[model samples]
Target: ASIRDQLHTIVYRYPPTYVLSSEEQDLVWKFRFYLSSHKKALTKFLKCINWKLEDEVTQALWMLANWAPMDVEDALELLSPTFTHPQVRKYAVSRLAQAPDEDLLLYLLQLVQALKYEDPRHIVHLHGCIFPEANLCTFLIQRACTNATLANYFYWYLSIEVEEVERKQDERAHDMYAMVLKMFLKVLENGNFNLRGIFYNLRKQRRFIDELVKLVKLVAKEPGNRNKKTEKFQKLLAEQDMFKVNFTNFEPIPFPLDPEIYITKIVPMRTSLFKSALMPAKLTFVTSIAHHEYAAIFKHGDDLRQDQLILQMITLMDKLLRRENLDLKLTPYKVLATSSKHGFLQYVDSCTVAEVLAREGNIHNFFRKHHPCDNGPYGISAEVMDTYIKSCAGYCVITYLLGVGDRHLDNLLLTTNGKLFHIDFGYILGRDPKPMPPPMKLSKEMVEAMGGISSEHHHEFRKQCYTAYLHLRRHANVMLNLFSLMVDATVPDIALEPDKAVKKVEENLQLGLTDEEAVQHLQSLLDVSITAVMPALVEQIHRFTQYWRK
Candidate 1:
């Protein structure tokens, strides 16, 4: 008889059990001997085995032999319910976990694409069963920036884990929390995913929050200074037209001289509506308030100082916006470095759109609840409604042109007097979490708050967005030059690919288009954003995940 026939007969004859009989042992050796010579026939025979009729031990042997040929897609097929065997599914995941990094990344991308619209349960299974063991969390976090589909999958994986822990509260919760915390610290130390999501998640567990704060303080206490490369880069920044400071007059703040600069009282602030675990906190000095006049919002884990650069860039854009007489009431707050990993931002003292929605239940009601009064929500002029509208439009255009990612209602603030601005620059330079995100984040809430898409205020908002984009285009060279100077800077995202950094900013500028053509292009983006459904879906998913955390 052929080797294939011999293996088939032995597999059929043996009972599926953990222990093999003496006769089965002899046949197993014979099967193993022929396995090397009759690979193709063995694979065919393995595939033909009916698990219902075959013993578990024989099925296991067939799986072990044939698993070598299974690619990522094949492994996924085995994981499906059609396979009807826990051991086989587990084996497939184990194989995937052991795949090389290059092969694994390709598989991850493929899996993400295949499961893009499917329920996240499959991904959660893969993540829970294999991804943690394989140590692929860090890999996924890092690559999330370049690939939107992968980012979506990774976020869902995390969201599902968060949900599971919240629901079960079992020993697995503790284990999973530690695993996630380790991954969180890894990303905090060196990662590009918006820290907002991670930080927000960490805040859910008080112990982890305390641990994170301790780590931040420990790093702060360590003696370090800006490296010579960064010092030289700062000098270049001072020379640029965009820079406000004079290098000759500038003096570096002495570190290790004051604990107040490094350590502060951290009060947890409200998290945003976006799926960000990294939320901002209020940081107050240990000493008296007279020492520090302004309240500062502390942000942790901005190792690359992307926020500072983006803030400065937006500040420059705001100046240019005003210079062109567009005057969209832009406010690019100050971001001061406290330590390499931490910083203090100028507290805007504004209420977020998220808070408004929560309080009043909807955007329309929020607007109605707060009339034009002197001491309104943010203490701004009540009649300054148009200013708020313009600011929204301004931010939409500016953030779009700069490719700022991770925009949602939470980071969008509205002052009592009717001024609007955005916070959190963690995800910028086109690294959005969603797949094919719109050029700008003009949510339905924002549109309705500005008087809906058909209203005159909404029309003006679009016009202002177009005007802002056009004005920025006129000074595209200046912005491009500013970005070029920072190509070598140690900023996290830019440092990854210096050449691509300048190109990304330039690509959005549409430098080749004429003034008329650029306006048309801007208009198209505005249209897409105004009628965007994806943002709504993303927001709903975020809220759904956030339900468990709350």
Candidate 2:
């Protein structure tokens, strides 16, 4: 047989561990040489190496180095994890990296898929290889902005090099970071991806933040003339009707069509107001209507059912609370459930009790600073206590009835005027993560806010809670009907058991019990919540967990 045939025969017969004879090795090199110039001969030689045979696979890859530059496409075809050994895959990837921009663009998605399991170094290198070509970079950026999965992978690959780049102070790193931020800005401009996490990470870098602000300003302003390159930016400007060019200066002006109503540019409050390692990032943007500006909290998460349910329940309870002569001053602040995975809540100028305590160093100090009595803090009225009781009672009943879980201090916000409410409804429908959690979140701090369980205000809080629960029970059908409409929703917790979603609400409403019995049942839950030690302990545990996570 010829040397090429002999080489193929030897590769298939001998296991990888078996040493090749001198003659066999010489024939292998000679076979590689012959395969170099002849495309068909190379294809036939490659076909003989069994993918499952490790030694034969390695030999084939070794010989593949002799592959002609013109056969880069064929080399990529062999780069699959399923058909090629790791060594061969690595070599094929390296060779493909040298392929022309058009060829890389043709198989970019497939190439990305193949490298998904490869080392980060290889992925980053491949990114660099293709990025120098403007056409490929633009194509990738456009595709990445539109396709979520591709965008996620692309962002992750780019993010992996951030630390190394910063450490090395490399100019290439700056270019790469700029490119990444630019692409991300496009995504943000279109509001296409769930980019809360991406934005959070980018916010960590000073350069990224500076570049982002600069990009936003540039995009906000119209170009003198439109060309092909600037058309996308122009479209972005048209899509996002308004853009805040300045982050700091926020001035309210009357709406163009309505002088009584006013509008203001949304300005980011801080880098991020809340931090949850496990949860998607929540960004706070300040906006104004009329004369007052409020914080609009935006969250990008996979579940919107909880937010929708909570918002609807709040609205229902607000009506019920008013009917019962218990005006909790509940600000069911407008919640826009934009999609299944994205939503925003307008915060009514509230500081969290946690933040208040953090600032004042103790609860007594907190009250001393904000309490509406003699020698108390300024800018607050004596009626603040009433507002506190009203809002607290309203939310407590609503939260209990809805089985809202994940009741941490940060999720609970207290307005400066004393209205209190809850946020972050990622877990609801009895989906408590802690062991033996209370049926409701009535923490010591919350009780303290109402002047403890023994105070007159506290008694009023309980009375209003009972009243709210009773009123909601009276409107059980309304609440149930609303939840029924949501049974087909794809929100996370509810979607887990959609058939039982309405049933859960019905159970919580205690529709079978008489009004008196249901009120007594709610009173029992309130008592259990106020006196529960688990919430306090869980709070401590949560603090520790958050500490470690940070």
Candidate 3:
């Protein structure tokens, strides 16, 4: 077929190569004129132009001028680190200005990270004083100041970046961050939307937890109390007015982990401490809201920022999947890192999968006991089975893409309602101590729980995985961009291998194949996973290492 008649074959030969492969560069260069006529080709064509070369850069700007306008979604694609040119991001910012305030809020996290890609000297005026990022910062701070929740998170993210930039000793970056802070503060003073209370409550809550930790440590030193130490800690908690009645207003201030949920009062009676080999005092927060009591883990002496990032990506992944017709029942529980050593984690009522196995006969048996139905094939209700399979596929795909290690029955939690999820992201991006584990936490047990490898339910699980993985692949560029922005943030896995931290995720995403081949790839991956004894031994070996408490 002639190249003119073969355009479909050319474009279909590769997926959306945002950073065009050599072959894609050839097609894009060959059809440069015709390609610019269609908005659909803009993202790929914009990527084909190499930014470092002065000649191609000029040509790219001309092509962008002639191209049809991109939607906010496509505009977001341009903000990824791939398109670093000032004019290109300006084009993106111009489109982003059209987005609604709440729409901007949805992308605020990634957008804040995208700002890291912009170098300050590029924005210097002719008179020679450098400036903060013009479009992104001004647009962000302007919009953020108008809304309290957005402004609060936007402010904290900048504050965290300021600390990190200082830690890295990038003197120039500090000035830029400082300038942004000053501008935010300027608007924040006497501006509407609980501007003062947001910061007030953030620090007040930090002090609340900090004081609790201090008392717990002091009481523990006496060494002769039987949960009496806990009771003493409880008495200390009750005496604090801040912990008892709501010190902050009812204006709905959010926690660091999630901007959507607001914090209310901390009820001291329901809150208690747990002893652990890992850390001395694992604490709890029994919050009273909607008159519905909720519990969150208050952890000290552990860096939860890494877990925070992992869950952020999971929440983002859920949004990506939900944006499409696929909703996989993934729970991106909230976590807040108030400092390097302390944070709060959303603790749902659930038992470890290992504990379930210890108590019940098998995985299916536990499900049947918890959610039973006689007519269902797998001994659980059809709805429950569907929930289980759907959840399994969700975690399997997400955890594998992240290269999340430390997989075992112990960390994987199953809910009474049949939702399956994972916790503790201590090792991610291939930092596992073991070698070549399954795509996710695996065993014969999990497969048999779905009724074995050849079972129709098992095949349905595979089907769910195939669709979910490919759906995420469609947005891999954005996800990869977010990780790129976070590499220097000193998260545990990324800090260990600073240079190649994001590379592991890039490798696991495995984004080159078309949908058809990705299905085959995933199918073979599942077969290799389920049929292997090595994975089970690796899993069982983990159990051996874990010290069981009587």
Candidate 4:
């Protein structure tokens, strides 16, 4: 008699496969699309399905939950409030709950699913997925007294899944549930061991280890009165040496330096060649002029001579930092560039920061504006893409903290060793930007890809960049003190003369200008540059919110 009557006839009269026929497939697709466009349709449609078709209805509903467009969310939200099946209602709420920037109505709409998914860990997932800004682990423990599924997935599954696939998978769904509670106890006793790294010290590390041991002892207190399952879990914990396991061994390498001689020797060859060619000629000319009116300027160890040498070194360093034309993969190490007694220049290594960013493809994109491709093309997740974006943001933070300028496309290198390194620092020691100038201007591609300097996505990236900025701030004083310690007072102190230091630094750095004007301009650009990354950050949050809606 009607569309509901027709759907009931097909759903009840035919099997799932037979009913999902040529005509029905098109109908279902149309329905999904229609629901996407006009969400209120779902509330009306939900009433039409027969109980006999619950499985098929559920399957179709779940399909909508996964791939339907944002508009479909409203219909799904309405359907969840009065769905007959508990699981179906739960699924609906979970869909809405996970959506980004969920509102009060959406959250109230989610209560059905929240109660449906009632498992504490899933709730934690919902909390973190929807409200990523919060400290998830703590929020879950304080509010729900449960373990986070994602955190437990790493802790429980990582070891067993690798060692015994058959046993692990057969028991995975069940084991994951059980492990959450046990892991919750372990996590609770540990008391923010994860956050301690933010304030890490030898004492804090030991305290963390001690707390872990106490958790093990607590688990041991339960004796033979326990059931078989409890005993089995205890045995597993004992076998794993819960307290003794080397967690630190698993800590990801922070800017790990490769030690292969090929990496070590090959990464610096171009600088050697450039120095061989440029140094001797320049030194001979300058040394000859030492007796002339300009002789004092050319005198060895003078500020002017040091400034000139620094600029030459910057040029040589820039040439050496490129991947194809140059082979060097510079790590973060201070080195003195010596030119066969012609002269020498000393500077901190900025290349390692590039390496970190390049590995993630963010540095490459930031500089070249090309979408950095990966081996698995077309299938990388949004999470992976976000990681790359964040990595690039991290690079920008580090570069800015180091006062790096002349950070154009060429300065970002992808080494054969698969490292990205920033190569030049000729502008340092306040040698440039005293008056003010535009620091490195943004490339067109970077500006577009980053969604322009004003977009919300750029703001999100700046937030992440701030994470790196805070990290640098923590150690900046120490690093600055170290540099001060290294620089010699008797060495004609170029940086101490703020004006000259600012000018020379800008020129060698190619920071886009000279004098006080240039210095002020550079400062202004840094202020704007911080804002430049905002658009990309906002886009990232929006992208996640979009995916979450489904």
lDDT of 3 by residue, 392-492 (tens): 99899998898889888877888887788898788888778887666656656777778776589888998899899988887776676567667655587
Q: Which candidate tops lDDT?
A: 3
Off by over 4 Å in 1: 1-280, 284-293, 373-382, 534-550
**After superposing candidate 2, which stretches have Cα over 4 Å from the reference?**
1-273, 277-294, 375-381, 534-550
lDDT for predicted candidate 1 compared with the true structure? 0.54
- Please state the error at residue 190 of candidate 4 in Å: 54
lDDT of 1 by residue, 204-235 (tens): 22232344455445434545443432233333
Which rank order by lDDT, best down to worst?
3, 2, 1, 4
All candidates' TM-scores?
0.47, 0.48, 0.81, 0.27
Instruction: Please report, as a residue range, the 10-residue window in candidate 3 with the lowest summed lDDT.
Output: 122-131
| Candidate number of the best TM-score | 3
Better candidate number, 2 or 4, judged by lDDT: 2
lDDT of 4 by residue, 3-57 (tens): 6646744343222113244454445445544444333333333444433364667
Residue-level lDDT for 75 in candidate 4 = 27
